[PDB]
Amino acid sequence: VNELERINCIPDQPPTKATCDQRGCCWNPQGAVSVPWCYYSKNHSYHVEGNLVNTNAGFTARLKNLPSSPVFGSNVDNVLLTAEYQTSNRFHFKLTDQTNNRFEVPHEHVQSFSGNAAASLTYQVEISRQPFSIKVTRRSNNRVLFDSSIGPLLFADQFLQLSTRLPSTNVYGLGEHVHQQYRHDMNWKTWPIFNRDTTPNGNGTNLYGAQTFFLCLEDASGLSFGVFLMNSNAMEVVLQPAPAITYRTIGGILDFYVFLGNTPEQVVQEYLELIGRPALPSYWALGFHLSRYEYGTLDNMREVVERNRAAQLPYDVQHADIDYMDERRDFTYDSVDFKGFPEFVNELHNNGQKLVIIVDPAISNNSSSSKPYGPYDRGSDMKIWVNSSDGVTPLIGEVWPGQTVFPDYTNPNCAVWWTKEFELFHNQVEFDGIWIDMNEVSNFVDGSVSGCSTNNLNNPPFTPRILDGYLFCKTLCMDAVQHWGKQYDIHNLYGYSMAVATAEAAKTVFPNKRSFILTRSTFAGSGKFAAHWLGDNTATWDDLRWSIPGVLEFNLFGIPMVGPDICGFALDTPEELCRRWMQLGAFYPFSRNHNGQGYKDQDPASFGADSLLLNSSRHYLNIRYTLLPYLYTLFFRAHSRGDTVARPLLHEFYEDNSTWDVHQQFLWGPGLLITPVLDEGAEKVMAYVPDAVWYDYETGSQVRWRKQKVEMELPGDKIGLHLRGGYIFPTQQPNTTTLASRKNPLGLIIALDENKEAKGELFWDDGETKDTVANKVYLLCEFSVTQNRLEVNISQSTYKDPNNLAFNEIKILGTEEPSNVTVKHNGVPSQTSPTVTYDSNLKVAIITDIDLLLGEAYTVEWAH
Ligand SMILES: *[C@@H]1O[C@H](CO)[C@@H](O[C@@H]2O[C@H](CO)[C@@H](O)[C@H](O)[C@H]2NC(C)=O)[C@H](O)[C@H]1NC(C)=O
Ligand SMILES: OC[C@@H]1[C@@H](O)[C@H](O)C[S@@+]1C[C@@H](O)[C@@H](O)[C@H](O)[C@H](O)[C@@H](O)CO
Ligand SMILES: *[C@@H]1O[C@H](CO)[C@@H](O)[C@H](O)[C@H]1NC(C)=O
Ligand SMILES: *[C@@H]1O[C@H](CO)[C@@H](O)[C@H](O)[C@H]1NC(C)=O
């Protein structure tokens, strides 16, 4: 009835009463824009047949199809509901064809459940039988979280749909898209999901990855929940103002998880506990990365490397794009334009830097007796290509080198082939990390060099609103064949399988190291293997603004090392845009300036040795590097516990509804507030100051604002950076590389809260060994301040850095003058009495001539 609650029965064409009648739906052409004229009745779909059956894990139910017209075809007579109370905070239910096995995602991390129902549930499940619906409610307040009763269950071979009411309009997630805002537009929006090489622009299309997870903040108490659909077929998600969300997919099964938490962070941690927590990055990967498509020659690349080094830019990583290769073919380098490549790699390494190489999936099939191409010959020997529908002939498409075949990374034999290719190539060019691109998989022809046969896979009864309207557009035929199944079912898993296989190759090429993998295409869980960048953006102010929601969303998806191409991939970048983008970009979890072919240089040093852009870039990159121990400890918590790294204001300040749609500012973890200027010509920014004590990072002075909108003054050389009272931030004196910075003196910034208290922590390991956390080879220490006292305590202590690191400076914000400062080491008074400098105007104390060894317990005490 209520028009906001109508579930659209004609998603496929403009609505007509004739089609409405044919489908047995309800007709009412009255309503506002976007309200469906034709909608499902209150008894379309399925009913429960007989009784539910208790099982050890939860229960099952048989659903029987309520007689109806077959809109998009073969509609399943008998559906089985299997429900599992997997944990106190996670519910799993799956709807399958009772009579036939159907494709299920072969996820690498998620395991089948074998236990008994969890005790102490935070939720209750309710089942209605006529018609079928399922509801998940929060036990403590009976808030209805998931409720499918707004709409039917639809379950045909190539058309599956289920809807849920939502308890609020605070909805975040879904991908990969450019949403433009972070809090969802619930006003009749459809988001298609199907991995596609397309521009992240203002048109709201399907982009490179597939992420079905969303989080909902139920109210200001912080209680939140999330939902994940384990399905890799083309789909779309429909948001409406009831509020409700509908999932509509074209194959597979409806395999759902519902997660509850007391805060938005706890929901993310529950999601990541299920699909896999992100890999811990190499510490060097947290530094600044520089890149462009078509330096053209090694000489031109060297020029760029050298002018940025000459400028003393913090600068850890150089990427090499397809111009390094011999005619854009993997596992080669151009012996003329890139003559001396191995010597250049030595220079990079000698200067404490890292090389990341681009590698594409598609392999040139141009190889002869006369002119052999090794990777193709060896791949063909092992028979690891994606085949055409005939099941035996490798599919031919077209990418950078010309005609190509495509590896089937779902075949574990393919990982063996891939690893060997990397071993051979690493012997020639000693790269340190790998950038996997075009892995949607991207094809320059639609389907294959012979197009695609018309059939129900290439041309399904219902096509979600993907870019160009055909599944095989700029990708492979839907009836192509791989180890895990047909492309129709596993298309969205290509980039995921490739990331898995590339991590496997790293085990051999980089024994016991993390290395670094940057991936374009992703599926749920890709973060366990890889970082992500947000794709081929454009040098516009809109693109700068749109990057923040994309970063925040990928942190929800457990891919916290994420960022756009700073300054913009496509087009020449205006100096002002690039300056603002470098200021902000210094605080993306993944910080990379990358540029498209032919455009004017946009590396920082290219703007002039004395320029405002270079000076500002260097300044804020130096702050980023100073705070790297804090950022690294955030990545430790994402890896070990599932926390976000780049974090929405509302995850910390959910009590305050002014934060619920803030997406022009974000946090690093709980304590650092980042406020960019995001408008052309502006020297200020309208910003929200949450309900906490804040201190300006640069001056240390407490801001006079709290829980209110403000116009923050930020001239051309500034970005807003504020530290939260109650938090202690570990720092380390910066250098132009992390190789070197990791050997420098440490520091602490203690930002006092109103009670003159604060707490913080520091994770420290070797920065590069894989699984130091799982194998327990690390240091974790805690800092806590009360009146008159700092305690440094050690909770895990199985790694001691051989560089004799020590805290040599402590800066205290929001303090009255400390006097008689005293340092004790395990109770014993130690090392003279430190030097204390005090600014009574700003209420800042700095303690120096101190040496608190990393890994040792101390008490530091003072009077007022
Ligand atoms: C793609 O086609 C090839 C043949 O071109 C298939 O290769 C088979 O691989 C298996 C196991 O590795 C061998 O035992 C067979 O002898 C191979 N067949 C032939 C004709 O050589 C390959 O299995 C196909 N891939 C997929 C996913 O179907
Ligand atoms: O390795 C070279 C480039 C690397 O620098 C980028 O980071 C990724 S890739 C450029 C590629 O994404 C782009 O050519 C699209 O395929 C088309 O625009 C397509 O979308 C048109 O249909
Ligand atoms: C933009 O999206 C709309 C659907 O919302 C579509 O009809 C149109 O073709 C798209 N165009 C491009 C170039 O993305
Ligand atoms: C910074 O790095 C260089 C090596 O590039 C090293 O020679 C120097 O001593 C380091 N300095 C610091 C910040 O102490």
Nearest ligand to the C-alpha of residue 387? Answer: 1
| Dihedral of the alpha carbons of 797, 799, 800, 801, in degrees to the nearest 10 | -140
The angle formed by the CA atoms of residues 847, 850 and 853, to the nearest 5 degrees, is 130
CA neighbor of 474 nearest in space, from 406, 560, 585, 399: 399
Pairing of strands 317-320, 289-290: parallel
Task: Report the alpha-carbon distance of residue 39 to residue 448 in Å, rounded.
Answer: 39
In this structure, the number of other CB atoms found within 10 A of the CB of residue 854 comes to 20
Angstrom CA distances, 164 to 247, 273, 569, 688, stand at: 9, 23, 38, 32
CB 398 within 8 A of CB 405: no
217 beta partners:
224
**Is the peptide bond between 730 and the residue preceding it cis, with omega within 30 degrees of 0?**
no
Environment class of 827 (CB within 10 Å of its CB; exposed 0-12, middle 13-18, buried 19+): exposed
The string over 288-314, giving b where at least 16 C-beta atoms fall within 10 Å of a residue's C-beta and e elsewhere, is bbbbbbebebbeebbbbbebbeebebb
Copy the structure tokens of residue 395. Answer: 């599919």
CA neighbor of 295 nearest in space, from 596, 638, 5, 65: 596
Environment class of 820 (CB within 10 Å of its CB; exposed 0-12, middle 13-18, buried 19+): exposed
**Is the peptide bond between 106 and the residue preceding it cis, with omega within 30 degrees of 0?**
no
Q: Which atom of ligand 3 is nearest to the CA of 198?
A: 14
In this structure, the number of other CB atoms found within 10 A of the CB of residue 280 comes to 26
Q: Which atom of ligand 2 is nearest to the CA of 358?
A: 1
Pairing of strands 235-240, 189-193: antiparallel
Compute and round to an integer the Cα radius of gyration of the chain. Answer: 28
From the annotation, which residues make up the binding site?
197, 321, 520, 536, 594
Q: Which atom of ligand 3 is nearest to the CA of 203?
A: 1
Place of tokens 């639609």: 446
In this structure, the number of other CB atoms found within 10 A of the CB of residue 340 comes to 13
Angstrom CA distances, 215 to 41, 233, 261, 404, 673, stand at: 29, 21, 10, 40, 22
CA neighbor of 842 nearest in space, from 728, 702, 725: 702
Q: Is the CB of 387 under 6 A from ligand 1?
A: yes
* Spacing of C-alpha 362 from chain mean position: 25
Task: Report the alpha-carbon distance of residue 462 to residue 402 in Å, rounded.
Answer: 33
Catalytic residue status for 437: yes
Task: Report the alpha-carbon distance of residue 846 to residue 832 in Å, rounded.
Answer: 17
Angstrom CA distances, 492 to 81, 363, 522, 563, stand at: 25, 20, 8, 21
* Spacing of C-alpha 200 from chain mean position: 15
| Dihedral of the alpha carbons of 358, 359, 360, 361, in degrees to the nearest 10 | -150
Q: Is the CB of 486 under 6 A from ligand 1?
A: no
Task: Report the alpha-carbon distance of residue 422 to residue 425 in Å, rounded.
Answer: 5
Task: Report the alpha-carbon distance of residue 360 to residue 330 in Å, rounded.
Answer: 7
Task: Report the alpha-carbon distance of residue 435 to residue 565 in Å, rounded.
Answer: 14
Which protein residue's CA is at the shortest distance from atom 4 of ligand 4?
740
CA neighbor of 234 nearest in space, from 473, 9, 70: 473
Tally the C-alpha atoms within 13 A of residue 730's C-alpha that lie toward its C-beta. 27
Task: Report the alpha-carbon distance of residue 516 to residue 317 in Å, rounded.
Answer: 11
CA neighbor of 598 nearest in space, from 323, 826, 857: 323
Phi, psi of 114 (to 5 degrees): -125, -10
The angle formed by the CA atoms of residues 82, 42 and 96, to the nearest 5 degrees, is 20
Task: Report the alpha-carbon distance of residue 368 to residue 188 in Å, rounded.
Answer: 56
CB 6 within 8 A of CB 16: no
Q: Which residues contact 481 (CB under 8 A, 6 or more apart)?
A: 386, 387, 388, 389, 391, 487
Task: Report the alpha-carbon distance of residue 655 to residue 220 in Å, rounded.
Answer: 4
Ligand 3 center–CA 59 separation, angstroms? 44
Task: Report the alpha-carbon distance of residue 396 to residue 103 in Å, rounded.
Answer: 25
Task: Report the alpha-carbon distance of residue 356 to residue 430 in Å, rounded.
Answer: 10
3-class DSSP state of 784? strand
In this structure, the number of other CB atoms found within 10 A of the CB of residue 596 comes to 20
Task: Report the alpha-carbon distance of residue 415 to residue 499 in Å, rounded.
Answer: 10
Ligand 1 center–CA 322 separation, angstroms? 31
The angle formed by the CA atoms of residues 407, 290 and 174, to the nearest 5 degrees, is 60
Which protein residue's CA is at the shortest distance from atom 1 of ligand 1?
392
Task: Report the alpha-carbon distance of residue 654 to residue 660 in Å, rounded.
Answer: 7
610 beta partners:
none
CA neighbor of 750 nearest in space, from 853, 671, 837, 838: 671
Task: Report the alpha-carbon distance of residue 240 to residue 34 in Å, rounded.
Answer: 9
In this structure, the number of other CB atoms found within 10 A of the CB of residue 502 comes to 26
Question: Helix, strand, coil shares of the chain as percentages rounded to 5?
Answer: 20, 30, 50
Ligand 3 center–CA 465 separation, angstroms? 9
Task: Report the alpha-carbon distance of residue 694 to residue 690 in Å, rounded.
Answer: 9
Which protein residue's CA is at the shortest distance from atom 11 of ligand 1?
383
Which protein residue's CA is at the shortest distance from atom 16 of ligand 2?
197
Structural domains in the chain, CATH included, are 1-39 (4.10.110.10), 40-277 (2.60.40.1760), 278-627 (3.20.20.80), 628-725 (2.60.40.1180), 726-864 (2.60.40.1180)
Query: Edge-to-edge strand order for the sheet containing 354-359?
Result: 562-563, 531-533, 517-519, 433-436, 354-359, 317-320, 289-290, 592-593, 565-566
Distance linking the first and last C-alpha atoms of the chain = 68
Nearest ligand to the C-alpha of residue 294? Answer: 2
Per DSSP, the residues of 108-144 read SS-----SPPPSS-SEEEEEEETTEEEEEEETTTTEE
Q: Is the CB of 432 under 6 A from ligand 1?
A: no
Mutate to test the pocket of ligand 1, among 376, 382, 392 (most ligand atoms within 8 A of CB): 392
Query: Edge-to-edge strand order for the sheet containing 666-668?
Result: 646-647, 666-668, 672-675, 720-724, 694-696
Task: Report the alpha-carbon distance of residue 721 to residue 673 in Å, rounded.
Answer: 6
Q: Which atom of ligand 2 is nearest to the CA of 535?
A: 7
Task: Report the alpha-carbon distance of residue 564 to residue 590 in Å, rounded.
Answer: 8
860 beta partners:
790, 823
Q: Which atom of ligand 2 is nearest to the CA of 597?
A: 5
Phi, psi of 546 (to 5 degrees): -70, -15
Environment class of 78 (CB within 10 Å of its CB; exposed 0-12, middle 13-18, buried 19+): middle
Copy the structure tokens of residue 567. Answer: 């300054």
Task: Report the alpha-carbon distance of residue 800 to residue 669 in Å, rounded.
Answer: 25
Task: Report the alpha-carbon distance of residue 230 to residue 108 in Å, rounded.
Answer: 12
What type of residue is 640?
A: S
* Structure letter (DSSP) for residue 830: -
Catalytic residue status for 84: no
CB 604 within 8 A of CB 309: no
- In this structure, is the dihedral angle defined by the CA atoms of residues 536, 540, 542 and 548, taken in order, positive or negative? positive
**Per-residue three-class SS string for 798-829:** CCCCCCCCEEEEEEEECCCCCEEEEEEECCEE
Task: Report the alpha-carbon distance of residue 785 to residue 768 in Å, rounded.
Answer: 31
Phi, psi of 738 (to 5 degrees): -70, -30
Tally the C-alpha atoms within 13 A of residue 637's C-alpha that lie toward its C-beta. 21
| Dihedral of the alpha carbons of 404, 410, 411, 412, in degrees to the nearest 10 | 120
Q: Which atom of ligand 3 is nearest to the CA of 468?
A: 9
CB 124 within 8 A of CB 136: yes
Task: Report the alpha-carbon distance of residue 590 to residue 584 in Å, rounded.
Answer: 12
Copy the structure tokens of residue 177. Answer: 């898209």
Element at 579 (helix H, strand E):
helix 575-585
Catalytic residue among 334, 440, 652, 661: 440
Task: Report the alpha-carbon distance of residue 6 to residue 35 in Å, rounded.
Answer: 7
CB 353 within 8 A of CB 308: no
CB 255 within 8 A of CB 229: yes
Task: Report the alpha-carbon distance of residue 592 to residue 589 in Å, rounded.
Answer: 10
Nearest ligand to the C-alpha of residue 486? Answer: 1
Task: Report the alpha-carbon distance of residue 489 to residue 469 in Å, rounded.
Answer: 17
* Structure letter (DSSP) for residue 182: S
* Spacing of C-alpha 96 from chain mean position: 30
Task: Report the alpha-carbon distance of residue 7 to residue 206 in Å, rounded.
Answer: 22
Residue 131 region by backbone torsions, left for phi larger than 0, else alpha for psi between -120 and 50, else beta: beta
Task: Report the alpha-carbon distance of residue 11 to residue 18 in Å, rounded.
Answer: 15
CA neighbor of 137 nearest in space, from 52, 225, 217: 225
CA neighbor of 111 nearest in space, from 84, 79, 146: 84
Ligand 1 center–CA 455 separation, angstroms? 24
Copy the structure tokens of residue 542. Answer: 């809109």
Q: Is the CB of 203 under 6 A from ligand 3?
A: yes
Environment class of 816 (CB within 10 Å of its CB; exposed 0-12, middle 13-18, buried 19+): middle
Q: Which residues contact 464 (CB under 8 A, 6 or more apart)?
A: 192, 193, 194, 206, 234, 235, 236, 248, 250
Which runs of consecutive H residues, i.e. helices, occur in 627-732?
Answer: 628-640, 649-653
Ligand 4 center–CA 735 separation, angstroms? 6
**Number of H helices and number of E strands within the chain?**
14, 52
Q: Is the CB of 392 under 6 A from ligand 1?
A: yes
Copy the structure tokens of residue 554. Answer: 């990928």
Query: Edge-to-edge strand order for the sheet containing 189-193?
Result: 154-156, 159-165, 244-249, 235-240, 189-193
Place of tokens 């308890």: 167
Pocket of ligand 4 (CB under 6 A): 352, 733, 735, 740, 744
Ligand 4 center–CA 852 separation, angstroms? 22
Strands (E) across 690-726 are located at 694-696, 708-713, 720-724
Which runs of consecutive H residues, i.e. helices, occur in 292-411?
Answer: 298-310, 341-350, 374-382
Which protein residue's CA is at the shortest distance from atom 2 of ligand 1?
392
64 beta partners:
47, 78
Place of tokens 């974790």: 780
CB 531 within 8 A of CB 159: no
In this structure, the number of other CB atoms found within 10 A of the CB of residue 125 comes to 17
What type of residue is 199?
A: T
Ligand 3 center–CA 581 separation, angstroms? 28
Maximum separation of any 2 CA atoms in the chain, in Å: 91
Mutate to test the pocket of ligand 2, among 197, 290, 399 (most ligand atoms within 8 A of CB): 197
277 beta partners:
none
Q: Which residues contact 496 (CB under 8 A, 6 or more apart)?
A: 108, 521, 522, 523, 525, 526
Pairing of strands 58-65, 53-54: antiparallel
Place of tokens 């005790």: 119
Environment class of 713 (CB within 10 Å of its CB; exposed 0-12, middle 13-18, buried 19+): exposed
Task: Report the alpha-carbon distance of residue 756 to residue 785 in Å, rounded.
Answer: 8
**Is the peptide bond between 176 and the residue preceding it cis, with omega within 30 degrees of 0?**
yes
**Structure solved via:** X-ray
3-class DSSP state of 782? strand
Query: Edge-to-edge strand order for the sheet containing 132-138?
Result: 123-129, 132-138, 143-147
Task: Report the alpha-carbon distance of residue 13 to residue 416 in Å, rounded.
Answer: 47
**Is the peptide bond between 441 and the residue preceding it cis, with omega within 30 degrees of 0?**
yes
What angle do helix axes 264-275 and 541-556 make, rounded to 10 degrees? 70
Nearest ligand to the C-alpha of residue 481? Answer: 1
In this structure, the number of other CB atoms found within 10 A of the CB of residue 168 comes to 14
The string over 320-336, giving b where at least 16 C-beta atoms fall within 10 Å of a residue's C-beta and e elsewhere, is bbbbbbbebbbbbbbee
Pocket of ligand 2 (CB under 6 A): 197-198, 293, 321-322, 358, 437, 442, 474, 536
Q: Is the CB of 469 under 6 A from ligand 3?
A: no
* Structure letter (DSSP) for residue 292: -
Total length of the chain: 864
Task: Report the alpha-carbon distance of residue 434 to residue 676 in Å, rounded.
Answer: 31
Which protein residue's CA is at the shortest distance from atom 11 of ligand 3?
203
CB 443 within 8 A of CB 437: no
What type of residue is 558?
A: G
What type of residue is 54?
A: N
Which protein residue's CA is at the shortest distance from atom 15 of ligand 1?
383
Ligand 3 center–CA 383 separation, angstroms? 39
Q: Is the CB of 178 under 6 A from ligand 3?
A: no
Task: Report the alpha-carbon distance of residue 564 to residue 533 in Å, rounded.
Answer: 5
* Structure letter (DSSP) for residue 282: P
Ligand 4 center–CA 736 separation, angstroms? 8
Element at 359 (helix H, strand E):
strand 354-359
Task: Report the alpha-carbon distance of residue 598 to residue 608 in Å, rounded.
Answer: 20
Q: Which atom of ligand 3 is nearest to the CA of 469?
A: 9
- In this structure, is the dihedral angle defined by the CA atoms of residues 399, 400, 403 and 404, taken in order, positive or negative? negative
In this structure, the number of other CB atoms found within 10 A of the CB of residue 753 comes to 16
3-class DSSP state of 300? helix
From the annotation, which residues make up the binding site for acarbose?
197, 321, 520, 536, 594
Mutate to test the pocket of ligand 3, among 34, 203, 463, 473 (most ligand atoms within 8 A of CB): 203
Q: Is the CB of 813 under 6 A from ligand 3?
A: no
Catalytic residue among 147, 218, 334, 437: 437
CA neighbor of 491 nearest in space, from 509, 500, 478: 478
Ligand 4 center–CA 818 separation, angstroms? 33
Task: Report the alpha-carbon distance of residue 551 to residue 549 in Å, rounded.
Answer: 5
In this structure, the number of other CB atoms found within 10 A of the CB of residue 609 comes to 10
